[PDB]
Nucleic acid binder design. Structure first.
Ligand code: MG
Ligand code: ZN
Ligand code: ZN
Lengths: 50, 1327, 325
RNA sequence: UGGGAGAGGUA
């Protein structure tokens, strides 16, 4: 049901929508969306439980 | 200085330039070498006046000889320095920006005026998208929000015809180019063709807004700020610190931001900057102006240097620490002290012990005046130093000054009005305010470290308020209920209980005494105790018909202690006042009886003397607590062991697998509750009657002299629950999840708890301590909301001459009498007579204050219900009359005109919030074949009237319930007369004969199945949501006919005997059988403080009860849909009304009967809005009063019903108009009900049709905001919304409220100021 | 897109994201276009005779020894003799203007010898705005002529742009407008006296300029297109280095001022660096722009950051005494 | 002296 509601197509469209949620009003692009989704969770300096 | 009105409106740029004195053009405030203010700065002397009194900046003009001149050297006008907080400046903004209040406070007023969405207006203001103002072509219309690409297309396409601008200047040009009367006329035509609900509401909102602009005379261009004004620099001051560094206000920072960005915009417009840079600077100026007007409103709040958001102008005025609620209502006050309070029992009732040093500091200018009058000091400096050196002549002058000069003892939180009282002070040596012990029940103050404020009245009028209105010997009775609050509390009560109790053979029993003086002589000589049952001679004085006192003298069988108190009890009271053991309720009745018989002065001296003797004999008693005085019952371990064995027996039965876990849980709780009740009963027995070792008749028994039982039975400190926790069992303690724990705390506070029981007890202790804090906050918020509704209510007239009223029946719900007629009606004024024969034929006329003698006559003749005038039904404009309110409860007589009712009513309601024969009526029945009578109505009540005529109980029977007793039958007690089916709802009949099974076929409306127990088939009517296509247009009917088949009619009506049964009916009766009359046919199945706050805020509940809006029969009209519509047609006229009922909700009223106005169609809680609109004003008043009093009686607090009626009358102030006559009300405008009453009075005076209306119960928050006074509404709550609505509509304040005259600074029209205000009103009328 | 954004610096970064960065070579071409506009505005203000008499009389004012030698000349005993022979060339072209291509070649030779005088920019603005205000005088004059011929007679506009826009010096066009037998031309007699006032006003323009309306219209038209080209080239140079402004102001953030104020004052410094940039020193744009952007940001945070404002010379003096002692 | 935050405590 979540896949039927979900309007994205693939990975780059998913990153653009995550960019539009996190930093709204900014024109998204591929490299900025990739760097944003990497450095939110999967970076050793901006995420830590450890 | 003597103004009649405070008119608020919008500010034109010409008016802002008329306020100002010079354009502020520099951000820098002052210098750093020498600290003189700059030129055209934020603190400048030429704009905001001079810094020193009568001096320029350079030092040329330096005296008052040059009174007012302008200095030609530096521009500083030589005046006083008081004009540094009266002169404003102005900033000349380059781009005109938008006001954030009239853009973001919803509804936005710019979206509501221009008819543009707020998102699109925000896109225009954020310079993101162009908007077009005017266009000659048909391609681009007015208000078509173009993007950048569309504008660049249109620029190369047309380029000459259209003009599209972007930003706040475009919105200013749009509001300029629009036409108010043209748009108002076009929308008035647009409202008339069709009326959808959302479109008509939006159109009438816009029409009300546009008509507000035209009638106020404002212009829509004034919402766009072109010229921004500047606060004076002593209202945004520059205060230093102790280390040279400065600590300015946040307003100087915000003004510096606005001035810097405006100067940069001027520089960028002169430098021919690029479009991106100048657009960003215009956006920055808009952001800075919006931040200065309201920081936290538009976007991210601009934070200061210490990471905190700055305080703007809207944050200075609005909030908990705003200007209104921190300085305008409650101010700091000179001539004031504060100290700890101790006990002085040597005082009188109107005295308090001020210390010497603290009162010398208080009364210092009075000592200055007496020193200069007596010639002991020539000058004020000599008098100052003589007081500061503390001489003996200064102490003598202070002793002379403080004599007969009352001071007010305030203690915060002042919940009710007895938290401020005036006392004649007596100078003591110490540092603590010695109160009287009696007034600490009014102050709610114990001496565990409390603190009280001492304020000193200065003027002669203020001393007379404190002497005649606020003296502590005047307010004995509480204003909540008419009972004395100057009452003995716990220590006088213990002493008087130990006095007037009697032993059996104590010392010197059975003598004869010459009177009270010889009894006191016997006790203080030591030949007889306080408990000797002795015969004394008592000379009591009864009251004559007039004020004379006749006497009688006889022998009474008394004690020595009661014969000691007869020296104290004044002349006028009987001996049955004294001749019982005096608990706290008994001494309360003594002081009440002494008040109503003698007056005030014998009551004051009786309270002082009874306190003296209570303290003296409690000291001579020696009533001590010990460890041998908390007597544990000797059968505690046996009951505990039996209960544990029974709990273990049910536990092993559950472990065997017979009884379920929830039933085991409920059984264990019920067993431990029964065990706790048995242990508590055995404990109470063994503590009450343990004293059995007696003599001089035999081994006799009496009540025990144990001190724990003594301080429990006296009502002094504690109750039977506290004694149970000390001696018996602790009981069942609850978890914080609400569920009661299975095993209870068996040990008490004498045997000592173990570790796990104490850890279980900490749950409830911390929960109760947490709950207490929450309720006090809630109660204070509720008290503030109640006061701010009931501010504007005062007594104006002596009598209104109305004939309405509320018939006060004693509340008789359940099996007992909740309130008697005496507590319900004592104090009010009878509207009509009392027409009953009775025994003595009491006939009180109208306009009679019901005294205690008249209420005694009503009790003797046993009147059921009397109609008295209430505050809600009063017909006086802007205030009530004295005869509808009745008795001033604090005094005991009729209420003086001019005294504010509503503040007393709101305080009395919100103060205990920190403590929170067979008679048949309305019937329609038929006698069956067996005499077991059935009722065919739902609203039938079973009244239980005694043989004297009064009512004992009350019960409501269901529809179709069986009944054995008829009218007039007197059944004995204990007989079960209520017999009814709880789960099934019958569909019973009233005729007899055969049944014709018409309009039901197996397959589309009924389900063919059988019962699993008897094998007989049963025809369950299938619900319409699961029927097939053949059952979407039929209703099955039990067509009852006669014995051969003709259509029998109902006797009385013309309707055929049909029964449209609903679904899920267990039809056991088949065709071809005989049916009697009245038999069944089928079976159809089915806190305290938040409740008070939800009743007074008038909330529609989660499941409202559907009611009938028009009287008549009810039928169904719409098919093939589960939303059951009711075509409730009248029995006389046509039906203009239908009603929509959801799927799952059941119905009580079937489609064959006739309902009255306001019948319960769907069961559940009924909402007070429709209660008013259908039943009536008196019905919704009675509903609110009864459901509030149910809460306040559950918790045990006495509150008179007139206070709740005052809040209801203040809630019902609005009245929308459904049809107009010739008055100036067009359609649906919520005007005040007093205004339409005055308009209808004028219209029926000069002979016209008049205008009808319909009232509406607003909540507390909505009524105090929709109060016509913007100052009262903004001081209560939502200052931004109230000031925005008032500024747009152009309102004015007429200065008629108590809160308004507190804010402005005049005498309130409440009490003493009422004469001055009515003199001022008649001066304004006669001229 | 344009969503629910509320930070203005985020919208600034969106509105600056539309432009592209500059390459290694392109800003030399933009600076060449800027210098071409400056050369065009100088070569169109060169041949104006009253401006030449203004510079000679300001040279008489500096040679009468009451004004300094810095507020009217920047560079190129030498300027004195070359202005003396310019004055000799001026007093011979005052009477060889009567004779006809000799007049055109002598005024263009005065125009090209004028190009050596490196004048001060404030008096350049004086020359440009003096041309602008005499153009405003004659423009409201012709707007008055345009207004009076549309208000009364409802005539088409092709005859007006062929008759009025010819010589418009003598009365040869007004009598031609009356003498074309049209029913409004016989009722243009009440307009006649204030248009004769307008004609003598045009004759006043002929004696204070010396040339006709058509030559000065062409001169200020060349002035307008050169000013528009130079301003558009300057504008394109400005909106391609805003990322440099945010790169400089990224470090001055928590100094008592908001982040958006810093990049705004950096944009002011960027404009001041664009207006005074010289491309012939080989440097691209950034080594010259960084100093001006840093100066504007530092002078912003040294003044508008505190209530008690300390001047910049006093705070470096107390800082120098704090670092030595 | 006056202003604003943060923490603690008393009724
Ligand atoms: Mg206390
Ligand atoms: Zn001066
Ligand atoms: Zn009344």
């Amino acid at each position: 049901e979540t896949l039927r509601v979900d309007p994205t197509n693939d990975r780059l469209s998913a990153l653009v929508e995550i960019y539009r949620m996190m930093r709204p009003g900014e024109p998204p692009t591929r490299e900025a969306a990739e760097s944003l989704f990497e450095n939110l969770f999967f970076s050793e300096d901006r995420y830590d439980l450890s | 200085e003597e103004f009649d009105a405070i008119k608020i409106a919008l500010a034109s740029p010409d008016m802002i330039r008329s306020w100002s004195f010079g354009e502020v053009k520099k951000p820098e405030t002052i210098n750093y070498r020498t600290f003189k203010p700059e030129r055209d700065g934020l603190f400048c002397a030429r704009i905001f006046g001079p810094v020193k009194d009568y001096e320029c900046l350079c030092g040329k003009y330096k005296r008052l000889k040059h009174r007012g001149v302008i200095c030609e050297k530096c521009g500083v006008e030589v005046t006083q320095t008081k004009v540094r907080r009266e002169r404003m400046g102005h900033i000349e903004l380059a781009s005109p920006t938008a006001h954030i209040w009239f853009l973001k406070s919803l509804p936005s007023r710019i979206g509501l005026l221009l008819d543009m969405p707020l998102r699109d207006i925000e896109r225009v203001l954020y310079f993101e998208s162009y908007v077009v103002i005017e266009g000659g072509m048909t391609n681009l219309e007015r208000q078509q929000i173009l993007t950048e690409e569309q504008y660049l297309d249109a620029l190369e396409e047309f380029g000459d015809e259209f003009d599209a601008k972007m930003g706040a200047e475009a919105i200013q040009a749009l509001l300029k180019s629009m036409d108010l009367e043209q748009e108002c006329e076009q929308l008035r035509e647009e409202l008339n063709e069709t009326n959808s609900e959302t479109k008509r509401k939006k159109l009438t909102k816009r029409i009300k807004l546009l008509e507000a602009f035209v009638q106020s005379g404002n212009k829509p261009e004034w919402m766009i700020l072109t010229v921004l004004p500047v606060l004076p620099p002593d209202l945004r001051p520059l205060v230093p610190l102790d280390g040279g560094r400065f600590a300015t206000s946040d307003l100087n920072d915000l003004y510096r931001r606005v001035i810097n960005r405006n100067n940069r915009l001027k520089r960028l417009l002169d430098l021919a900057a690029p479009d991106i840079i100048v657009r960003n600077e215009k956006r920055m100026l808009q952001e800075a102006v919006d931040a200065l007007l309201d920081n936290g409103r538009r976007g991210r709040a601009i934070t200061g240097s210490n990471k905190r958001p700055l305080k703007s102008l809207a944050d200075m005025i609005k909030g908990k620490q705003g200007r209104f609620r921190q300085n305008l209502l409650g101010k700091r006050v000179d001539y004031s002290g504060r100290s700890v309070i101790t006990v002085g029992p040597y005082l009188r009732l109107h005295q308090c012990g001020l210390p010497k040093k603290m009162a010398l500091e208080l009364f210092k200018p009075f000592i200055y005046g007496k020193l200069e009058l007596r010639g002991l000091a020539t000058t004020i400096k000599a008098a100052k130093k003589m007081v500061e050196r503390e001489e003996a002549v200064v102490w003598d002058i202070l002793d002379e000054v403080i004599r007969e000069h009352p001071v007010l003892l305030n203690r915060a939180p002042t919940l009710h009005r007895l938290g401020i009282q005036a006392f004649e002070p007596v100078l003591i040596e110490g540092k603590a305010i010695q109160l009287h012990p009696l007034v600490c029940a009014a102050y709610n103050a114990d001496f565990d470290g409390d603190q009280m404020a001492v304020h000193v009245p200065l003027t002669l009028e203020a001393q007379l308020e404190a002497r005649a209105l606020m003296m502590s010997t005047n307010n004995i009775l509480s204003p909540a209920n008419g009972e004395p609050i100057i009452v003995p509390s716990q220590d006088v009560v213990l002493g008087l209980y130990y006095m007037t109790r009697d032993c059996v053979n104590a010392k010197g029993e059975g003598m004869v005494l010459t009177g009270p003086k010889e009894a006191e002589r016997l006790y203080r000589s030591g030949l007889a105790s306080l408990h000797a049952r002795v015969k004394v001679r008592i000379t009591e004085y009864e009251k004559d018909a007039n004020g004379e006192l006749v006497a009688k003298t006889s022998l009474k069988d008394t004690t020595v202690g009661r014969a000691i108190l007869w020296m104290i009890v004044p002349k006028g009271l009987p001996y049955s006042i004294v001749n019982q053991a005096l608990g706290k309720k008994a001494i309360s009745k003594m002081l009440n009886t002494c008040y109503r018989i003698l007056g005030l002065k014998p009551t004051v001296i009786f309270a002082d003397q009874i306190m003296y003797t209570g303290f003296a004999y409690a000291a001579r008693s020696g009533a001590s607590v010990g460890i041998d005085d908390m007597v544990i019952p000797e059968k505690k371990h046996e009951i505990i062991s039996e209960a544990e064995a029974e709990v273990a027996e049910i536990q092993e039965q559950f472990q065997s697998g017979l009884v379920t876990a929830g039933e085991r849980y409920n059984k264990v709780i019920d067993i431990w509750a029964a065990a706790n009740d048995r242990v508590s009963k055995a404990m109470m027995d063994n503590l009450q009657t343990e004293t059995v070792i007696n003599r001089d008749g035999q081994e006799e028994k009496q009540v025990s002299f144990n001190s724990i039982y003594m301080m429990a039975d006296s009502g002094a400190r504690g109750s039977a629950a506290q004694i149970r926790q000390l001696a018996g069992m602790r009981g069942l303690m609850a978890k914080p999840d609400g569920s009661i724990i299975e095993t209870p705390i068996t040990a008490n506070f004498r045997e000592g708890l173990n570790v796990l029981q104490y850890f279980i007890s900490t749950h409830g202790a911390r929960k109760g301590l947490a709950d207490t804090a929450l309720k006090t906050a809630n109660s204070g918020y509720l008290t503030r909301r109640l006061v701010d509704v009931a501010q504007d209510l005062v007594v104006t007239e002596d009598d209104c001459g109305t004939h309405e009223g509320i018939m006060m029946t004693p509340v008789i719900e359940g099996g007992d009498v909740k309130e008697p007629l005496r507590d319900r009606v004592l104090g009010r004024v009878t509207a009509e007579d009392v027409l009953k024969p009775g025994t003595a034929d009491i006939l009180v006329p109208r306009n009679t204050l019901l005294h205690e003698q008249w209420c005694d006559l009503l009790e003797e003749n046993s009147v059921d219900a009397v109609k008295v005038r209430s505050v809600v039904s009063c017909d006086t404009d802007f205030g009530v009359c004295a005869h509808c309110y009745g008795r001033d409860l604090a005094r005991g007589h009729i209420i003086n005109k001019g005294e504010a009712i509503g503040v007393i009513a709101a305080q009395s309601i919100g103060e205990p919030g920190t403590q929170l024969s067979i008679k048949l009526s309305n019937v329609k029945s038929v006698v069956n074949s067996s005499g077991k009578l059935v009722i065919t109505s739902r609203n039938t009540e079973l009244k239980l009237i005694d043989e004297f005529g009064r009512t004992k109980e009350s019960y409501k029977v269901p529809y179709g319930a069986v009944l054995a007793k008829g009218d007039g039958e007197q059944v004995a007690g204990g007989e079960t007369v209520a017999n009814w089916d709880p789960h099934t709802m019958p569909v019973i009949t009233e005729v007899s004969g055969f049944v014709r099974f018409t309009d039901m076929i197996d397959g589309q409306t009924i389900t063919r199945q059988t019962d699993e127990l008897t094998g007989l088939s049963s025809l369950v009517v299938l619900d319409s949501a699961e029927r097939t296509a053949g059952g979407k247009d039929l209703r099955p009917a039990l067509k009852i006919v006669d014995a051969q088949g003709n259509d029998v009619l109902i006797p009385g009506t013309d309707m055929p005997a049909q029964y449209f049964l609903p679904g899920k009916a267990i039809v056991q009766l088949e065709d071809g059988v005989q049916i009697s009359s009245g038999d069944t046919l089928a079976r159809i199945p089915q806190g305290g403080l938040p409740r008070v706050a939800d009743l007074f805020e008038a909330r529609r509940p989660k499941e409202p009860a559907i009611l009938a809006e028009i009287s008549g029969i009810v039928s169904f009209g719409k098919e093939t849909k589960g939303k059951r519509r009711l075509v409730i047609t009248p029995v006389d006229g046509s039906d203009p009304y239908e009603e929509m009922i959801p799927k799952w909700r059941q119905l009580n009223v079937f489609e064959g009967e006739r309902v009255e106005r306001g019948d319960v169609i769907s069961d559940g809680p009924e909402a007070p809005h429709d209660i008013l609109r259908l039943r009536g004003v008196h019905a919704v008043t009675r509903y609110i009063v009864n459901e509030v009093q149910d809460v306040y009686r559950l918790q045990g607090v006495k509150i008179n019903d007139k206070h709740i009626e005052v809040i209801v009358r203040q809630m019902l102030r609005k009245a929308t108009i459904v049809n107009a006559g010739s008055s100036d009300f067009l359609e649906g405008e919520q005007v005040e009900y007093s205004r339409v009453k005055i308009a209808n009075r004028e219209l029926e005076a000069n002979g016209k049709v008049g205008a009808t209306y319909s009232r509406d119960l607003l909540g507390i928050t909505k009524a105090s905001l929709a109060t016509e006074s913007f100052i009262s509404a903004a001081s209560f709550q939502e200052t931004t919304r109230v000031l925005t609505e008032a500024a747009v509509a152009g309102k004015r304040d007429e200065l008629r409220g108590l809160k308004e005259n507190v804010i402005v600074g005049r005498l309130i029209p409440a009490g003493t100021g009422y004469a001055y205000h009515q003199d001022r009103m008649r001066r304004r009328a006669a001229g | 897109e344009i969503g629910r954004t509320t930070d203005p610096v985020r919208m600034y970064m969106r509105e600056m994201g539309t432009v592209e960065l500059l390459t290694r070579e392109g800003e030399i071409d933009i600076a060449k276009r800027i210098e071409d506009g400056i050369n065009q505005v100088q070569c169109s203000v060169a041949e104006y005779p009253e401006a030449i008499t203004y510079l000679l009389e300001q040279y008489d004012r500096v040679e009468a020894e009451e004004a300094r030698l810095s507020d009217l000349i920047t560079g190129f005993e030498l300027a004195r003799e070359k202005f003396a022979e310019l004055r000799a060339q001026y007093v011979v072209t005052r009477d060889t203007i009567k004779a006809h291509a000799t007049a055109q070649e002598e005024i263009l030779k005065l125009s090209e010898v004028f190009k050596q005088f490196r004048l001060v920019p404030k008096q350049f603005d004086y020359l440009v705005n003096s041309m602008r205000v005499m153009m405003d005088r004659v423009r409201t004059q012709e707007r008055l002529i345009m207004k009076l011929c549309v208000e009364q007679c409802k005539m088409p506009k092709k005859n007006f742009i062929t008759l009025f826009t010819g010589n418009e010096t003598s009365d040869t066009w007004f009598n031609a407008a009356i003498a074309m037998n049209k029913p409004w031309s016989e009722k243009l007699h009440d307009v006649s006296e204030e248009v004769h006032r307008a004609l003598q006003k045009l004759q006043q323009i002929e004696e204070e300029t010396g040339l006709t309306i058509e030559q000065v219209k062409d001169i200020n038209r060349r002035m307008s297109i050169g000013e528009a080209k130079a301003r558009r080239a300057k504008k394109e140079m400005v909106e391609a280095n805003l990322r440099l402004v945010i790169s400089i102001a990224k470090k001055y953030t928590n100094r008592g001022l908001q982040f958006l104020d810093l990049i705004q004052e950096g944009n002011i410094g960027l404009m001041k660096a664009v207006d005074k940039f010289e491309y012939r020193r080989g440097y691209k744009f950034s080594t010259y722009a960084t100093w001006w952007i840093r100066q504007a940001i530092t002078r912003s945070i040294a003044d508008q950051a505190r209530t008690i404002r300390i001047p910049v010379h006093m705070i470096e003096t107390i800082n120098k005494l704090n670092r030595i002692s």
